[PDB]
Design a protein around this nucleic acid. Structure first.
Lengths: 46, 48
RNA sequence: ACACCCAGCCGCAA
């Protein structure tokens, strides 16, 4: 664990197992929505 | 009832009000054996 | 070879 690793610079994306997507008999988990939002803002800042 | 012999003591008899309750064993009974499995935890699910 | 997604809220049992 290094001081430079103290700061997050590459945000890991958990697999779909951690954020399962279930259809109503394609709903997305809250974490999936938040990660969609953060990638959207990352593209905007880019 | 079984023997027919008088009971040595003397029992307290008489009518009174009793109520059946909503709780029924046929509803509370439950068992599980490798049944359906939760999507997230990959573990057994909630409720009978 | 089964079919029903989850969060919240509430009542209630020991």
């Amino acid at each position: 664990a290094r001081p430079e690793w103290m700061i997050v610079t590459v945000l890991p994306v958990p697999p779909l197992s951690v954020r399962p997507a279930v259809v109503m008999q394609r709903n997305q988990d809250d974490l999936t929505h938040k990660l969609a939002d953060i990638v959207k803002i990352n593209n905007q800042l880019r | 009832g079984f023997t027919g012999r008088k009971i040595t003591s003397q029992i307290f008899i008489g009518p009174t009000y009793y109520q059946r309750l909503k709780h029924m064993v046929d509803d509370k009974i439950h068992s599980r054996a490798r049944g359906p499995i939760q999507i997230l935890n990959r573990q057994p699910m909630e409720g009978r």
